[PDB]
């Protein structure tokens, strides 16, 4: 009824190119009404795409993207409503040569434009990249990246280094590759940071006649990550920069069967004792170092994840308990209709039979239009801050009250309203104001007028205000550089691939400071109470960033009383990988 006669439709021109994508919108609130949504696309004589537009902007006679192409189809220019205008040209060898971006259309505001260029080896060499350059507006060009390659001396061959980049100087400093396997896996890499890397004023500019000069712009400290690998080129062990060793083992099918951690100057301890799999190779049963067992359950037909069951089993020193028993109910295409948890200790949902347990409803476009859940009665209205931690664990259904969220979406799939309706309290509404000519959008408190929305964004689609009186600065590469209030700041640094290597937070009244350095399987966290160290912390992280991770906290200095050193924190996730429970090395809830 809701989904009846709502197909996806592809409309061709007379050359078999897609002129229109048609969709059919229907809200369960109003099942009588069906809104047809047409996304037009234009092509030129050659058959290359020139224009696209969403239904909302087509309705208003405007366009989302315009494309200008060379005669082979290569896109030399994109004018986007959301991300501005940019010009691109590859050389005849197919390599990046120039990109000019941060340009706005009205002809073309070129004044804040970033020009990125590449320099390769000369024609008598293979043509590997030598440096990347970035020139912003009227400022002098800065050399943001450099590459140095190995020759093929016997020593280099012995390290499987021949012709590969051994020194990559990037936006954060240097990455040095000192050893490679027969299988091609990096066995020893070494990172050094820029001098004065905590200051967001310091940008990489690798000026100088050779490596002797470039190295003089780097800090002294070396963060060495070492790796061990099997005959298939698959990682077995990782030694982090503070000497902590992570180890894994593979079963006869090549799947992870166990893992261990050896903290520096300690003995090896079990992080994953065992791990079995279904026929499809998806986790079935997982046994942790803390004796906690995870049992995963799958629909036999669709292989969809039906159950996540976490428990301390029979004969466990801390006493048997089911900590989580998640169950999922899908609609036919695999949207989540219902989530139940019978292990929930408070027994909250069988007490409150007015609103149902995590029920979700969707429109014909599979957008979430309604949801129900529980919140803690004390949370109050959602903003940017995290609620206050309730300590200790609440012990009764009074602690949590139910809620029902309702979501509203425009013709271009912008989320314009989150409406919150609790059981027995005053509800609130968060309104998001969409631009009249783009999908740029901000909360109502920033503006309630569509025509002023794009002025809160840079040309490239980067938001300049986070909240009222909190300002945002972005790098030349559109990464978040700095959050500043208009007196607590935060700022960031990234490597060559835009992956955050550094975060520094500062509060000045005396200036209190915290720093996070992100390395392989390791976060070095520190703090100073005005150039005097209050805290020094290794967060050892075991696993992969898209799966239920295990953290170990080791304090070099400044451990607070009430935390035993080298305490492991096991994390336990839901369907979407959100961290829901933490347990300790006894399996007890943290």
């Amino acid at each position: 009824s809701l989904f009846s006669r709502t197909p996806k439709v592809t409309v061709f021109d007379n050359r078999g190119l897609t002129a229109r994508d048609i969709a059919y919108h229907r809200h369960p609130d109003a099942p009588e009404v069906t809104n047809e949504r047409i996304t037009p696309h234009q092509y030129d004589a050659r058959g290359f795409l020139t224009q696209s537009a969403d239904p909302r902007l087509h309705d208003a006679g405007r366009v989302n993207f315009s494309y200008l192409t060379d005669l082979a189809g290569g896109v030399l220019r994109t004018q986007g409503a959301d991300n501005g205008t940019s010009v691109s040209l590859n050389d005849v060898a197919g390599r990046p040569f120039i990109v000019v971006s941060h340009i706005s259309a009205t002809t073309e505001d070129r004044s804040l434009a970033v020009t990125r260029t590449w320099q390769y080896e000369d024609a008598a060499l293979p043509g590997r990249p030598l440096n990347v350059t970035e020139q912003i507006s009227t400022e002098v060009a800065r050399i943001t990246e450099r590459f140095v390659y190995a020759g093929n001396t016997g020593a280099e061959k012995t390290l499987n280094l021949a012709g590969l980049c051994v020194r990559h100087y990037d936006t954060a400093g240097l990455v040095q590759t000192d050893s490679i396997a027969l299988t091609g896996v990096s066995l020893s890499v070494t990172r050094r940071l820029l001098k004065d890397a905590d200051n967001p004023d310091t940008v990489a500019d690798w000026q100088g006649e050779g490596a002797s000069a470039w190295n003089d712009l780097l800090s002294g400290e070396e963060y060495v990550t070492l790796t061990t690998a099997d005959a298939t080129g698959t990682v077995l062990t990782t030694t982090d920069a503070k000497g902590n060793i992570q180890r894994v083992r593979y079963d006869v099918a090549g799947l992870l069967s166990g893992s261990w951690l050896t903290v520096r100057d300690r003995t090896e301890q079990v992080i994953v004792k065992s791990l079995t799999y279904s026929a499809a190779g998806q986790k079935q049963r997982e046994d942790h170092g803390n004796g906690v067992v995870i049992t995963y359950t799958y629909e036999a037909e669709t292989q969809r994840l039906t159950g996540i069951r976490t428990e301390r089993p029979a004969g466990h020193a801390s006493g048997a308990k089911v900590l989580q028993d998640l169950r999922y109910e899908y609609d036919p295409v695999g949207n989540v209709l219902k989530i139940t948890n019978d292990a929930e200790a408070t027994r909250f949902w069988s007490n409150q039979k007015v609103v149902p347990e995590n029920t979700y409803t969707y429109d014909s476009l599979y957008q979430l239009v309604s949801a129900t859940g529980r919140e803690m009665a004390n949370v109050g209205q959602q903003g940017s801050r995290l609620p206050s931690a309730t300590v200790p664990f609440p012990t009764d259904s009074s602690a949590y009250t139910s809620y029902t969220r309702t979501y509203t979406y425009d013709e271009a799939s912008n989320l314009t309203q989150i409406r919150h309706s609790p059981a027995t309290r005053s509800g609130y509404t968060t309104n998001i104001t969409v631009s009249n000519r783009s999908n740029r959008a901000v909360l109502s408190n920033l503006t309630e007028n569509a025509a002023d929305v794009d002025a809160l964004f840079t040309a490239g689609g980067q938001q300049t205000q986070l909240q009222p009186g909190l300002g945002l600065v972005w790098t030349a590469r559109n990464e978040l550089l700095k959050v500043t209030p208009v007196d607590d700041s935060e700022n960031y640094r990234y490597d060559g691939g835009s992956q955050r290597i550094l975060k520094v937070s500062v509060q000045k009244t005396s200036a209190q400071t915290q720093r996070a350095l992100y390395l392989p399987g390791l976060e070095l966290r520190s703090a100073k109470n005005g150039d005097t160290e209050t805290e020094s912390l290794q967060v050892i992280t075991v696993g992969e960033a898209s799966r239920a991770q295990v953290r170990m906290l080791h304090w070099e200095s400044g451990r607070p009383d009430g935390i035993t050193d080298d305490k492991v924190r096991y994390s336990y996730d839901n369907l979407t990988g959100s961290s829901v429970l933490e347990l300790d090395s006894d399996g007890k809830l943290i």
């Binding site: 007379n14 005669l71 220019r77 040569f97 073309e108 069967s257 190779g281 036919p332």
Partner: protein, 1446 residues
């Protein structure tokens, strides 16, 4: 351009030879091709195919098959050649040639004494010939010595790829008169040479007397003519541009790196005896079915069958080692098995064998064939013939094909002077091949008296011969020799004054009367019979004389000549009782040879003619119950079924009923009807006569009130049905062909093809719990016969259901006319029409695709494609007969999707073509969508809005995309290279819908002065492409066509608009220069068109001729550095690459396959594979240095690894193996294993049966039971129930492989053996994949390969040590699409779970495909549906939520 990178062959899936059945054509024949599996060497190689045709006759590879290179032969189809200036020659394509014209319009002759720059001993007259239809524009020369005594003539064919071929230079490559070498029937390919200086040489063996009986030698002294292909040499060591046959002496055998050796029975056939390079000393074997052919006016005798083809490589030479006393080593071996038979020998198996270094054989499963056969045992008995019940049993009738319909009707005289004919017809509601006879038609009145000619059947030609006994006999002219009425030589001697009477005694055999060789005397009323009949199976009316104890046959050699008498033993009757009247001559077994049927009072005795050599022991056939044959009775042999084989029709007055028939066979024997690859795939083929098809067609034409006109007067055996069985899934595909508008041409005595083919494809599935609705597809296709009275009736039959579709295309005829040249249309004369229409024979006119699914839209096609043809007439020395080049100039495709009113439509037109057939100007047109109708033509279940919303203005824009191009050629001097890439440009034209011509575009409307692609009209420049060459004049090609670079346009003035707000002219341009782009002239320029920015790609430096012009360096652009290439000794393969950073890769080669086995990378680490005798990777490892020290696996020198012999052994290996991977291949597992010990023990006979079954190829020497060898044995000798029991308990399983992968180096004691098993089917498709996993819960496989299941119905679970995860399990339909794809599952065994258990118990998504092979529906394992609907202008997708609401 492809930059050469060295790498080892990757692992792996089981697949065969590349054997393939042909698409069903308008000739109606079954075809089959096997590529000969042998090395390509350097690249220049023989590349031959062993191919079958149902139309083809006997030869060195058995009935139907051949494997030979190009030849030129004297024409034999239009009279026998006499070796004078009046003879004609045939091109390799079989097409008649004439002497060509030159620039000045004369006979293109010249004298020469230099050929390819090489002085010839004397002068030659060199005549260019041109074939009537031009395929490739090959140049063909006849080389004739000026003084005829100086030598023999030869032919040269210059292929337009730049290669040069010479035929019959030396006498071994000539089929010539045994009596007189001057008289040359055929010149066979002897040597090829390419522009790189690479050669292939073809060596033939002449026929001879070795291993023949003295009986044979006596009967056939003229036996030296025939040639057999014997050795092919390639990979010449010395690079030479000129042909080797032009040097003083030919190269030594040792100057060729590769050989291909055709064995004719001399070597031991056994897979255990390794064939050697030299032949041994027992000589080639004599086939039993020896046969002669007389086409060329000379006997050509045939005694040899090819039993093996062998690939030999010179391993020492290739490895730059000492060549002294090198024997070439065998690489691959192809065995050929025949069913040897005295009448007809047939090819029943080909198999690949190779050898391990310990000498022991390794084998692929044999590819088997079998044929329709005549069974001596089950001859159908008599049966009453109610079709003749209107006659009383005394009344004389002839069963004869009076009108030329390929089936005989009834000719009879009612009262004297009054002759009627009852024409054959389909009996309604009988068997589907049942023949009845229609209404009487009076013949014309016949003259007072005379033997004389007459046009009895009303076809215009005097082709019936009337005589009188006073009775009257009708005899077709084709049953007598060709110049019967103006005889010469022996024919004159025999008839003298002229014969008194001619009497048919069979379908094409005729008895005679009257009142250098020793010919017979035609006595008045003797105890002897004389006749014309084909007693030899060569296809001529020979002279035969039969007495009571002798059969003598004199071969017709043409022009009235008759050669020495041949005897045929095995026929006799007592000298008192022998009566000539009781003798009949007819091909009973369809072997080609007329057999003897002799009639006694109570039986018939049939003497089968054995390939014209002798007669068999006679088959005795009893007459019906209580019949006594005598003078009152009537008996004749006549092909009443229309099968090309005689049945017998008998009238007996003293009997009830009076009329009987005996059909001796219901199939035409010796036609291929079964292939089986022994891997799970069998194809069964079914034939049906064109004659039988004609009676179906005639009934339809009569039911519709029209007058039928047959144009095909004899029965051809057409490919009617194919059934392709998947023996593993139990699924199949049926392909049925139907034929109409058959055309044979009297004037040229040539078959033209069928005017209409209807093809029906139907999937058949085994039963499942989620059933797939099978919906057959129908393709209806029309082809030109080139006879206009047929071709003009075809468009009438096209689908008329779209009143707005454009009108049918019409053939254009052109003449080439020069100017600063071009095609110009003309209307030819009725004389030239015949030849120019003939040039379109077999060309596709129109094709329509349907799905016969019983829906309302079923009568409406998915798509319709139609073609227009242009024949360009070309002059020759013959004024009466022009040459012709047919091409396809327009192609129009309509996409309807079974909705008639709203199709999409596109059209591609070749406007101009150069003199060599290459396209110069062409255009691709996309028509606008039709004006929107008032109501929606699409079904009412879609959204109401969609029909209106389906419309877009982009659908209404007419697009024409114009493409120009030109080419390099090298025709100067005596070289010939055509169509080399040069320049191309593309231009876009776009108009509104009003400007589309109302009746569509034609070529004419596009070349007209007011054209929408005229140079007046505005356009959008789309780009251009140029190839530049090196090593010749400027950037023009030499004969070696060495590319300098490729150049394509990247920016024009329009595309530079990109930079307008960001860069300025000066900065923009100097960036483009530094980016490696450059300005070049815009091609096919118009007035004021600026230069364009171009990118250049693909630079190579090549070697000189001594290095076979091989590439020595490569780079993609001038911005990056070059990579060096170093070759091995003989420039076969590259052994080292070195890049611009000095980084070095090296490779050593396994020279039996010319693939690397070892590889040193840039860091000097080593990679290694062991290849098996078929070139597959059975083991691999690597080692080198890592982190300062030696690393990886132990070396093959340190720790050699033996690959286990079986999967069982391999699954039982202990950790510590020094290989990354190893692989066991089981390609023959679908064949049951049967050992001598199995057999000998189960009988207690000491191998008496085993050695009988091995001989009969029921089982292979290595113990595999052959599918068709079994069936053949079971049909002839049966099989005891003791053997059947044994065989029923021996299982089988789909082709499979096991790959073991180690996860650690062998130094590490943690090493595990990962185990992966793949299953393939008989079509080479991946069936399932099994990965060994840790012990745990799995489902259960029984010994019978089924799933164990609980009483509750769900699979029974157990914990097991032997657990496997099965993934990607797929059930395929006929077209190879995944019809069911199963979820992964655990199983306590690597073995195959039956498709039977899978369908019942395992979860699977079902995918349903439409007649275009597009997925339109999916039924998910849970029960839901995804559906998809295809229309010309939109596609509609519905997911599981959408469809669930229905």
């Amino acid at each position: 351009m492809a930059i050469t990178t060295l790498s080892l062959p990757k692992g792996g899936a089981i697949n065969g030879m590349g054997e393939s059945v042909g698409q069903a054509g308008p000739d109606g024949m079954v075809t089959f091709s096997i590529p000969l599996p042998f090395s390509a060497g350097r690249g220049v190689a023989p590349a031959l195919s062993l191919s079958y045709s149902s139309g083809a006759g006997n030869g060195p590879f058995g009935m139907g098959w051949q494997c030979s290179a190009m030849s030129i032969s004297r024409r034999t189809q239009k009279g026998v050649p006499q070796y004078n200036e009046d003879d004609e020659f045939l091109s390799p394509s079989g097409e008649v040639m004439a002497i060509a014209l030159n620039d000045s319009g004369f006979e293109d002759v010249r004298t020469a004494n230099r050929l390819q720059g090489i002085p010839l001993p004397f002068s030659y007259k060199v005549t260019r010939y041109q074939p009537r239809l031009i395929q490739d524009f090959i140049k063909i020369e006849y080389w004739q010595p000026v003084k005829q005594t100086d030598g023999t003539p030869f032919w040269i064919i210059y292929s337009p790829d730049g290669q040069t071929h010479i035929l019959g230079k030396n006498s071994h490559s000539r089929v010539a008169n045994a009596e007189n070498p001057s008289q040359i029937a055929s010149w066979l390919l002897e040597e090829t040479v390419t522009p790189t200086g690479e050669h292939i040489y073809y060596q033939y063996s002449g026929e001879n007397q070795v291993n023949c009986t003295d009986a044979e030698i006596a009967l056939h002294p003229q036996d030296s003519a025939q040639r057999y292909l014997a050795r092919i040499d390639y990979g010449n060591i010395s690079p030479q541009a000129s042909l080797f046959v032009l040097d003083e002496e030919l190269p030594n055998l040792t100057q060729w790196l590769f050989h291909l050796v055709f064995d004719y029975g001399e070597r031991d056939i056994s897979i255990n005896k390794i064939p050697t390079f030299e032949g041994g000393t027992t000589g080639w074997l004599a086939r039993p079915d020896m046969f002669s052919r007389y086409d060329f006016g000379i006997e050509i005798r045939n005694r040899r069958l090819c039993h093996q083809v062998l690939g030999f490589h010179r391993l020492e030479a290739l490895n730059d080692r000492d060549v002294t006393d090198e024997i070439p080593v065998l690489v691959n071996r192809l065995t050929l098995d025949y069913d040897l038979n005295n009448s007809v020998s047939t090819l029943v198996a080909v198999r690949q064998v190779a050898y391990e270094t310990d000498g022991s054989p390794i084998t692929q499963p044999p590819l088997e064939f079998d044929y329709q056969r005549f069974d001596t045992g089950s001859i159908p008995g008599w049966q009453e013939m109610p079709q003749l019940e209107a006659f009383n049993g005394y009344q004389p009738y002839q069963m004869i094909d009076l009108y030329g319909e390929g089936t005989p009707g009834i000719l009879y005289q009612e009262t004297p002077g009054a002759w009627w004919y009852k024409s054959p017809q389909r009996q309604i509601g009988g068997d589907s091949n049942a023949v009845t006879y229609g209404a009487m038609k009076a013949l014309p009145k016949i003259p007072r008296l005379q033997a004389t000619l007459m046009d009895i059947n009303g076809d215009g030609r005097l082709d019936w011969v009337i005589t009188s006994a006073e009775w009257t006999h009708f005899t077709p002219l084709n049953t007598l020799p060709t110049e019967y009425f103006h005889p010469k030589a022996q024919l004159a001697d025999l008839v003298g004054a002229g014969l008194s009477d001619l009497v048919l005694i069979g379908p094409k055999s005729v008895r005679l009367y009257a009142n250098n060789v020793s010919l017979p005397v035609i006595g008045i009323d003797s105890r002897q019979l004389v006749a014309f009949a084909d007693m030899l199976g060569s296809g001529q009316q020979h002279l035969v004389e039969i007495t009571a104890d002798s059969v003598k046959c004199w071969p017709n050699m043409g022009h009235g000549r008759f050669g020495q008498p041949l005897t045929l033993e095995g026929f006799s009757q007592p000298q008192t009782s022998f009566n000539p009247d009781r003798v009949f001559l007819a091909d009973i077994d369809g072997s080609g040879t007329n057999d003897i049927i002799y009639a006694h009072s109570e039986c018939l005795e049939i003497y089968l003619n054995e390939s014209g050599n002798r007669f068999s022991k006679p088959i005795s056939l009893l007459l019906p119950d209580g019949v006594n044959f005598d003078n009152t009775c009537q008996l004749q042999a006549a092909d009443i079924q229309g099968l090309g084989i005689a049945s017998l029709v008998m009238t007996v007055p003293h009997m009830s009923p009076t009329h009987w028939r005996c059909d001796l066979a219901l199939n035409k024997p010796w036609l291929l009807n079964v292939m089986n690859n022994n891997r799970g795939a069998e194809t069964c083929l079914f034939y049906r006569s064109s004659a039988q098809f004609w009676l179906d067609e005639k009934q339809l034409v009569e039911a519709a009130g029209q007058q039928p006109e047959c144009h095909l007067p004899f029965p051809m055996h057409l490919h009617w049905r194919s059934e392709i069985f998947d023996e593993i899934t139990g699924n199949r595909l049926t392909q049925e062909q139907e034929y109409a508008h058959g055309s044979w041409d009297g004037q040229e005595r040539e078959f033209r093809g069928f005017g209409r083919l209807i093809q029906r494809d139907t999937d058949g599935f085994a039963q499942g719990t989620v059933d797939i609705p099978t919906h057959p597809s129908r393709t209806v296709s029309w082809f030109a016969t080139g006879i206009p009275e047929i071709d003009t009736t075809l468009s009438a039959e096209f689908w008329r259901g779209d009143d707005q579709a454009f009108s049918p295309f019409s053939p254009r005829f052109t003449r080439w006319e020069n100017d600063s040249g071009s095609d110009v249309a003309f209307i030819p004369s009725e004389h030239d029409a015949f030849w120019l229409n003939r040039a379109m024979k077999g060309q596709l006119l129109r094709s329509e695709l349907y799905g016969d699914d019983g829906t309302p839209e079923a009568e409406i096609p998915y798509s319709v494609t139609e073609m227009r043809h242009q024949v360009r007439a070309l002059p020759t020395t013959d004024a009466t007969v022009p040459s012709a080049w047919c091409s396809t100039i327009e192609t129009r495709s309509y996409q309807y999707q079974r909705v008639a009113a709203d199709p999409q439509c596109s059209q591609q037109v070749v406007i101009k073509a150069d003199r060599y057939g290459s396209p110069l100007l062409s255009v691709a047109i996309n028509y606008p969508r039709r004006k929107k109708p008032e109501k929606s033509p699409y079904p009412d279940d879609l959204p109401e809005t969609l029909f209106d919303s389906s419309y877009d203005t982009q659908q209404q824009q007419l697009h024409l995309t114009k493409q120009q191009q030109n080419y390099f050629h090298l025709t100067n001097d005596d070289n010939w290279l055509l169509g080399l890439p040069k320049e191309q440009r593309n231009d876009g034209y776009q108009y509104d819908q009003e400007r589309a011509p109302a009746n569509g575009f034609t070529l004419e409307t596009l070349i007209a002065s007011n054209s929408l692609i005229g140079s007046n009209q505005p356009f959008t420049y789309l780009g251009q492409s140029r190839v530049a060459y090196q090593g010749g004049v400027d950037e023009q090609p030499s004969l070696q066509a060495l590319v300098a670079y490729g150049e394509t346009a990247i920016l024009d003035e329009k595309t530079l608009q990109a930079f307008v707000g960001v860069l300025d002219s000066k900065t923009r341009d100097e960036l483009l220069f530094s980016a490696g782009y450059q300005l070049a002239p815009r091609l096919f320029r118009v007035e004021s068109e600026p230069d364009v920015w171009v990118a250049r790609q693909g630079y190579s430096e090549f070697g000189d001729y001594s290095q076979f012009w091989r590439p020595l360096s490569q780079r993609s652009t001038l911005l990056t550095g070059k990579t060096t290439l170093k070759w091995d000794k003989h420039y076969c393969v590259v052994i080292e690459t070195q890049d611009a950073a000095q980084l070095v890769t090296q490779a050593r080669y396994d020279y039996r396959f010319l693939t690397p086995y070892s590889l040193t990378d840039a860091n000097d680490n080593q990679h290694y594979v062991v290849l098996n005798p078929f070139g597959e990777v059975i083991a691999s490892r690597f080692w080198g240095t890592e982190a300062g020290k030696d690393a990886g696996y132990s070396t093959p020198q340190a720790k050699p690894f033996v690959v286990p012999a079986t999967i069982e052994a391999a699954l039982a290996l202990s950790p510590g193996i020094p290989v990354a991977h190893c692989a066991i291949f089981e390609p023959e597992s679908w064949m049951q294993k049967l050992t001598q010990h199995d057999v000998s023990e189960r009988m207690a006979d000491n191998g008496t049966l085993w050695n009988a079954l091995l001989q009969a190829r029921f089982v292979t020497e290595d113990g595999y039971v052959c599918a068709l060898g079994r069936r053949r044995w079971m049909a002839r000798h049966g099989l005891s129930v003791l053997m059947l029991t044994l065989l029923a308990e021996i299982p089988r399983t789909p082709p499979h492989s096991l790959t073991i992968t180690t996860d650690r180096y062998d130094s590490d004691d943690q090493q595990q053996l990962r185990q992966r098993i793949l299953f393939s089917d008989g079509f080479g498709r991946l069936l399932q994949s099994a990965q060994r996993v840790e012990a745990g819960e799995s489902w259960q496989r029984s010994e019978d390969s089924s799933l164990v299941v609980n009483v509750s119905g769900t699979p029974a679970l157990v914990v097991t040590d032997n657990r496997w995860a099965v993934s990607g399990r797929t059930e395929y339909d006929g077209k190879g699409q995944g019809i069911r794809v199963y979820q992964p599952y655990f199983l306590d065994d690597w073995r195959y779970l039956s498709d039977d258990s899978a369908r019942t118990d395992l979860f699977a998504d079902t995918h349903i495909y439409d007649p275009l092979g597009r997925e339109y529906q999916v039924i998910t394992a849970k029960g839901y549906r995804r559906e998809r609907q295809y229309t010309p202008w939109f596609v509609v997708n519905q997911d599981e939520n959408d469809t669930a609401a229905n």
